[PDB]
C-alpha cells in the first residue's frame, strides 16, 4: 500500500464555475530525495498564475495539483539538504514545473525556501513568498534600482499598488531603497491603504498616468514597475519615464509596443519568479536567501503581511472561491486558505 | 548680405527617386554661440536613420540631414573649452538639429571627438554614429561587464558586416573578453567579419539557434541585433541564456516581447540620439567615447569600416548613397567627401 494525503487538483482545465474545475482528491504522499525538503503545508495563497494554469494546462499524472505559495513545517529532508531540518518552519513559492502546494505535503528544493517569520501566523506568512520574490527580483535583479539613471527623479512608479504583487512591492521599495515611491490605486479606500503600506505618493490609475506624475513636480521617475494593465498604460509610461530609464512588467499584455520606448532608449525588463527554478540557474539559491531577508524584515516590523482574506480549510470549495476572487481582478492584497479538515 | 554655403536638403519627405528627394541648396552660414563649435565639413556618412528621416519627416524652409562627419573646427562659441579653431574632429551630432550635409555645421562641443590622426577624412567619417551606437549598446545598455550567471561569456551580434555590426564586432573584441559570435551570409562577408575580430562567424540565412548551439559553447549571455530583428526574434529567444540581455537598434514593426518572458530576458533599446536630444547629464560621455575610439584607432586596435567612397557631397551622390543604404546590401560604410564639382 502507499501512504496518502489529501489534495486539491484537476484533470480538465476549465472555467471556475465548472463543478469539476477543482476537486478534492487523494494522492500518494511523496518522499524527498537529493536537495528536496518535504513540507507539511499549513496554508497556501492563490496568485494570478494559479488561474492561468488552471484554465489552460492539463496534467501531463491523472491529476494536476497547483499552488505556488505555502507556509508549513519541514517534515523530512533529502540526503543532500543542509539548509533545513525536520521541524523547521518555512515559507516559499516553489516551481511551476513541479506539483504545487495545494496538498498536505509538498516537495520543494531547499535552495528556494525561506525561514517562516516568527511574528506571523501560518496564513499571514503564506500571503508573502511568490509576490515577495517577484518584487525583490524586479527591483534588485531586473531594474537594478541601486544603479542611478542620470538626471531622472530617484523615484519608482508602481502601477497597481493595491493588488498581490503591488501591496508587497510598495513596502519593499519604501523599506529597502531610497526611492521616492509613487503607487497607483483607484478607489479612495485602496488609495489609503497603498499609502499606509509606504507609498510616498498615490495616484489614480483611472486617469492618464503621465499627467498625474508630472503634477507631483518631482521630475521624471527613473523606474517603472507595472503589475497590471500594461497595454492601457504603456504610452503614458513612455511619456512619464526619464530618458534612459528602465521599465519592468510582470503582466501579460497582448499587444505591447516596444517602439514607444525607443526615443528614450528605455529598457524593458521581464520579471518571472519561475525562471530561476525552472532553468536551475546558478543564482537560484538567491530566492531562498531573499525570502530569509524578507522574513527578517517582517520580524523586525519593517514589512508586514498582505493577507486581506482568510479561508479555511484548504479544499476545492474554498480554492474555487479564492480563484474566482483572484480572477475578478478586484481584490486588494492576498487571499490565503489555511488548514486541512472539515 | 548673409555669408552662405552649399548644402544638400529637402522640403518634401519622399522615396529616393523623386527629382526633389534631395536637392542642392544654398543656405546662410551659421555662427556658433554658447558651447557649440562650427565645423568645416570634409566628409559625411549615410546611416539608415538618413533614409528613415528623409522618408517621413518634413521641415525651416529646407531640411538638412546627415548624422556623421569629420572636419575642421572653423569657429567656436564663447563657452567652448574642449576644442579650438584648427582642431580636427569627428562626431555624429543630433537628430533635432540641422545635419552634417553642408559645408559648415554646428554641434555641441560635448558630443564631439578628436579625429584619429591615422585616418583620412572619409575613413574617420565612417565611424562616429555607429561607434557611439555600439559602445553605448555594450557598456551603457547591456552593461556587458556584468556577467549573466551560468550563461556562456559570449555576445551574438546579428548583422556583423553592416554599418553598426562592422565596428561593434571590433569594439566587443578589443574592449571585452567575451567570445564574439557574429553573423554574415556570404563567404566574403564571413571572412571580413572574421578579420574584424569575431571568434566565430555563423550564417544568418540559417535558423540562428541551431547555428549557435553547434558552436558547443552554451547559451550566450548577450545578443545585439542590428538588422532583421523580427525575422530572428524567436530564434534569439531560443538561443539566449536565461536571465540574459538582448539589445536591438533596428526598428522591427511586430516585435513580440512575450517571446522573452519565460527566460526573464530584458530588451534594451539603443538610440544614440537620446542623450543629445534630451540633454541628459551624461551627454558629454558621447564626446568622451569618441575620444577613446579615436585613440583606439590610432593605437591600431580599431580599423575603419569605410567600404564605398563618393565625391563630392551633392544631391546626386547623396541620392545614390541613400539608395545603397536602403537596399541593405552594402557591407561597412558609404562615405561622401568634399565640396566641389
Amino acid at each position: 500500500y502507499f501512504q496518502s494525503m489529501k489534495a486539491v487538483g484537476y484533470n480538465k482545465p476549465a472555467p471556475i464555475t465548472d463543478d469539476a474545475s477543482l476537486l478534492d482528491i487523494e494522492l500518494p504522499k511523496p518522499a524527498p530525495a537529493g536537495h528536496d525538503i518535504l513540507v507539511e503545508v499549513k496554508a497556501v495563497s492563490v496568485n494570478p498564475v494559479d488561474y492561468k494554469v488552471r484554465r489552460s494546462t492539463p496534467p501531463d499524472t491523472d491529476w494536476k495539483v497547483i499552488g505556488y505559495d505555502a507556509a508549513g513545517i519541514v517534515s523530512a529532508v533529502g540526503p543532500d539538504v543542509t539548509l533545513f531540518r525536520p521541524g523547521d518552519e518555512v515559507f516559499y513559492a516553489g516551481s511551476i514545473i513541479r506539483p504545487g502546494t495545494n496538498a498536505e505535503f509538498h516537495l520543494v528544493d531547499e535552495r528556494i525556501v525561506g525561514r517562516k517569520p516568527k511574528t506571523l501566523d501560518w496564513a499571514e506568512a503564506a500571503a508573502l513568498p511568490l509576490t515577495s520574490i517577484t518584487a525583490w527580483e524586479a527591483f534588485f535583479d531586473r531594474l537594478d534600482v541601486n544603479k542611478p539613471v542620470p538626471g531622472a527623479a530617484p523615484a519608482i512608479l508602481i502601477v497597481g499598488g493595491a493588488g498581490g504583487v503591488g501591496s508587497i512591492a510598495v513596502q519593499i521599495a519604501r523599506q529597502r531603497t531610497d526611492l521616492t515611491v509613487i503607487a497607483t490605486a483607484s478607489r479612495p479606500e485602496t488609495q489609503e491603504w497603498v499609502k499606509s503600506l509606504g507609498a510616498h505618493h498615490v495616484i489614480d490609475h483611472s486617469k492618464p498616468l503621465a499627467a498625474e506624475v508630472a503634477a507631483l513636480g518631482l521630475g521624471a521617475p527613473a523606474f517603472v514597475f507595472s503589475t497590471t494593465h500594461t497595454d492601457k498604460h504603456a504610452a503614458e509610461i513612455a511619456d512619464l519615464i526619464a530618458p534612459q530609464g528602465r521599465f519592468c512588467l510582470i503582466d501579460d499584455p497582448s499587444a505591447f509596443d516596444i517602439m514607444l520606448f525607443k526615443r528614450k532608449a528605455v529598457s524593458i525588463h521581464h520579471e518571472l519568479m519561475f525562471t530561476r527554478p525552472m532553468f536551475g540557474t546558478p543564482d537560484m539559491s538567491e530566492q531562498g536567501r531573499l525570502l530569509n531577508d524578507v522574513s527578517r524584515l517582517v520580524d523586525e516590523g519593517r514589512l508586514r503581511t498582505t493577507l486581506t482574506n482568510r479561508l479555511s480549510p484548504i479544499n476545492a470549495a474554498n480554492l474555487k472561491q479564492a480563484h474566482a476572487l483572484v480572477e475578478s481582478g478586484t481584490a486588494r492584497g492576498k487571499v490565503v486558505i489555511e488548514g486541512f479538515g472539515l
Side-chain angles (χ1 to χ4, degrees), chain A residues 72-337:
Chain A
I73 298 156
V74 181
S75 169
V77 299
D80 304 297
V81 164
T82 69
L83 293 170
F84 300 98
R85 62 219 209 267
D88 284 344
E89 291 174 342
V90 293
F91 72 160
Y92 62 94
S95 187
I96 206 183
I97 60 167
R98 296 193 83 180
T101 60
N102 295 347
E104 297 183 272
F105 297 85
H106 177 250
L107 296 168
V108 53
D109 188 293
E110 52 169 344
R111 290 159 294 195
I112 61 184
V113 175
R115 282 179 295 273
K116 180 191 160 290
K118 296 175 210 294
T119 59
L120 297 186
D121 69 24
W122 299 111
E124 301 168 324
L128 289 171
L130 187 146
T131 57
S132 299
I133 297 159
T134 303
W136 190 284
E137 286 185 352
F139 296 160
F140 306 117
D141 292 291
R142 313 306 180 211
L143 290 171
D144 188 11
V145 296
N146 289 321
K147 185 136 80 27
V149 171
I156 183 166
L157 170 71
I158 299 176
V159 184
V165 170
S167 56
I168 192 54
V170 162
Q171 305 189 58
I172 291 164
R174 174 68 177 270
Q175 303 290 327
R176 286 267 99 150
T177 76
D178 62 353
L179 300 167
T180 301
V181 180
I182 307 164
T184 73
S186 64
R187 287 177 275 124
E189 63 269 23
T190 69
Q191 291 171 349
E192 293 178 34
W193 190 58
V194 170
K195 189 141 196 298
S196 75
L197 292 169
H200 291 99
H201 297 98
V202 172
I203 69 193
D204 182 348
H205 55 56
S206 68
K207 293 175 192 205
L209 294 182
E212 301 315 295
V213 165
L216 301 178
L218 311 164
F223 305 118
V224 181
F225 175 46
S226 175
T227 62
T228 193
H229 292 89
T230 288
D231 270 341
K232 170 175 177 161
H233 299 295
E236 288 300 309
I237 290 159
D239 186 2
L240 69 81
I241 197 168
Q244 316 181 102
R246 309 202 277 270
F247 169 39
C248 171
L249 79 164
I250 51 160
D251 60 324
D252 298 322
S254 48
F256 181 82
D257 175 13
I258 68 162
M259 303 295 303
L260 289 165
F261 295 95
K262 161 84 159 185
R263 191 159 197 258
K264 281 175 192 185
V266 166
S267 52
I268 298 136
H269 300 258
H270 280 296
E271 151 63 10
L272 181 55
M273 47 67 66
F274 296 124
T275 296
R276 277 165 165 187
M278 158 176 294
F279 291 91
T281 63
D283 55 354
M284 183 184 70
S285 68
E286 292 314 307
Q287 295 195 335
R289 298 171 183 152
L290 81 88
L291 287 176
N292 286 333
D293 291 338
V294 167
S295 181
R296 174 177 93 146
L297 292 161
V298 168
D299 286 346
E300 289 166 352
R302 294 176 94 236
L303 297 179
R304 67 216 192 247
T305 184
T306 50
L307 173 61
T308 56
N309 282 129
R310 183 194 305 232
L311 300 176
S312 62
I314 302 166
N315 53 31
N318 286 330
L319 278 166
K320 282 170 170 181
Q321 175 170 6
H323 279 227
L325 188 63
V326 179
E327 293 185 341
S328 80
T330 60
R332 99 197 136 76
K334 294 292 307 206
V335 52
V336 175
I337 309 78

